[PDB]
Amino acid sequence: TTLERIEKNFVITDPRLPDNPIIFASDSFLQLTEYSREEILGRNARFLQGPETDRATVRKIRDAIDNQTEVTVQLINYTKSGKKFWNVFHLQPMRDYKGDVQYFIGVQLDGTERLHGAAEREAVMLIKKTAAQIDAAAKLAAAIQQAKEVAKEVEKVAQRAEEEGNPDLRDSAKELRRAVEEAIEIAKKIGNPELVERVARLAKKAAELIKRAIRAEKEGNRDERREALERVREVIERIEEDVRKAMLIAKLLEAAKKGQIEEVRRLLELGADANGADGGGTTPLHLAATSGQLTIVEILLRQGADVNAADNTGTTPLHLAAYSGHLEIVEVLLKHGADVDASDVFGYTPLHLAAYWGHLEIVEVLLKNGADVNAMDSDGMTPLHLAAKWGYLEIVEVLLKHGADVNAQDKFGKTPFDLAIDNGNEDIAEVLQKAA
Ligand SMILES: Cc1cc2nc3c(=O)[nH]c(=O)nc-3n(C[C@H](O)[C@H](O)[C@H](O)COP(=O)(O)O)c2cc1C
Ligand SMILES: [Cl-]
Ligand SMILES: [Cl-]
Numbered sequence: 001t002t003l004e005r006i007e008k009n010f011v012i013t014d015p016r017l018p019d020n021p022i023i024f025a026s027d028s029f030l031q032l033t034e035y036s037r038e039e040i041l042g043r044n045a046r047f048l049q050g051p052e053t054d055r056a057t058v059r060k061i062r063d064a065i066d067n068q069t070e071v072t073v074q075l076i077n078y079t080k081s082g083k084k085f086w087n088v089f090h091l092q093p094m095r096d097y098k099g100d101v102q103y104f105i106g107v108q109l110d111g112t113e114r115l116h117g118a119a120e121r122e123a124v125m126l127i128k129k130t131a132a133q134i135d136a137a138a139k140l141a142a143a144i145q146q147a148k149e150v151a152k153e154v155e156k157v158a159q160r161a162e163e164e165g166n167p168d169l170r171d172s173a174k175e176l177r178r179a180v181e182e183a184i185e186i187a188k189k190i191g192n193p194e195l196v197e198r199v200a201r202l203a204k205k206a207a208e209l210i211k212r213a214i215r216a217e218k219e220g221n222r223d224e225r226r227e228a229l230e231r232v233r234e235v236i237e238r239i240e241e242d243v244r245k246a247m248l249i250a251k252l253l254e255a256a257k258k259g260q261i262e263e264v265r266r267l268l269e270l271g272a273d274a275n276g277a278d279g280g281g282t283t284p285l286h287l288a289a290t291s292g293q294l295t296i297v298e299i300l301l302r303q304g305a306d307v308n309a310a311d312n313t314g315t316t317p318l319h320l321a322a323y324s325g326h327l328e329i330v331e332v333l334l335k336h337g338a339d340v341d342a343s344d345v346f347g348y349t350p351l352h353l354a355a356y357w358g359h360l361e362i363v364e365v366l367l368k369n370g371a372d373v374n375a376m377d378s379d380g381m382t383p384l385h386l387a388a389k390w391g392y393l394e395i396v397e398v399l400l401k402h403g404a405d406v407n408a409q410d411k412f413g414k415t416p417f418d419l420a421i422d423n424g425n426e427d428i429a430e431v432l433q434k435a436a
């Protein structure tokens with residue numbers, strides 16, 4: 001299936017069955033855990049736990065499942081041979097359009113230790129992006145199934161029109177079956193199961209109206225046949241417009257990632273949506289920003305791209321430019337109204353990223369554009385914490401000049417000074433001590 005395409009550790013469970021068993025285990029999961037598929041299907045995932053597993057952590061999982069909400073935790077699990085591993089584990093419910101839970105998705109990122117700060121952030125976003133793709137792949141597989149069913153009915157409507165000597169109605173049906181196939185292929189490209197579902201339902205309508213045209217024809221009703229056919233033509237036109245809009249978006253994302261300036265321009269001139277996004281919320285501006293495509297950045301902003309577009313993990317183009325160390329892109333996004341304080345789902349601002357990645361001139365520019373020097377992530381860490389932990393003496397100095405709080409304490413009651421001492425960064429400890 002599409003889920004057999006995803007090469008990550010995950011399982012899907014069925015909460016409608018007694019004790020919420022695993023109904024799907026990716027081969028990565030089987031490879032991680034040293035169990036066979038036969039050993040795993042029909043089992044509750046708690047068999048991964050063992051002596052060292054933190055029972056309060058497991059109670060967090062229990063409460064999140066019982067409240068039908070998502071949760072992310074880190075907890076010790078065990079292979080079949082009894083090998084300990086750390087598991088960054090993300091849970092989220094897979095719901096119907098009615099908003100009613102049907103499965104649970106569970107993604108495991110295996111490691112040797114408990115992660116904190118920036119490594120914790122990286123793991124959390126990875127597994128959150130895996131879960132979202134598993135959701136989309138499942139919603140796509142279901143939408144595509146229904147659409148191939150409509151496509152088969154359109155083919156029988158084509159055969160019926162031909163049998164009845166209506167090649168115009170037969171030709172409309174054939175066009176309609178091609179448009180649905182087109183929709184399926186573009187929707188996989190951009191991760192948009194809503195496009196498939198919308199196009200399948202419109203194709204179904206055009207099929208019903210062709211059949212209404214055939215019945216009008218057998219009764220000799222000229223006016224009814226012509227009106228049914230005109231409506232069929234405008235439904236096919238509407239389907240072709242939908243597919244074209246989705247195809248321009250797929251092409252504009254691809255042009256931005258490739259760095260094709262003239263192609264970006266051409267596609268925007270044809271009416272490509274500057275704010276079109278893949279299933280994960282990535283925009284052309286995200287791809288240009290992260291790859292240092294300054295001209296493409298300026299073109300997109302001029303053509304109405306949202307400088308502050310957030311993907312599914314709250315990541316903005318300013319974040320991507322800041323970690324990537326694209327100083328001129330950072331300058332241009334800020335010049336065009338980028339929110340200097342945008343926080344992702346982990347609480348990281350662009351300044352957190354600049355500080356962790358050791359981009360001193362980017363830290364300077366963010367600060368000079370009004371960045372909150374004391375912004376705290378979900379672990380209570382400020383940029384000064386990150387600069388002190390990672391040995392960035394000059395960034396430490398710049399943060400202090402721009403008002404960084406020497407006394408700010410993270411989740412663990414640690415100040416930047418404490419992290420400097422804990423990490424051997426005695427020169428930094430001295431600057432922080434003098435500043436206090
Ligand atoms: C989709 C999904 C995946 C899960 N994956 C894991 C896992 O990788 N590791 C783990 O220790 N528990 C995992 N669990 C949690 C357990 O199955 C169970 O919910 C947890 O132990 C708390 O409930 P309990 O107190 O009844 O055991 C997962 C649960 C679900 C719904
Ligand atoms: Cl860190
Ligand atoms: Cl009609």
Ligand SMILES: [Mg+2]
Nearest residue numbers: 019020044065
């Ligand atoms: Mg359970």
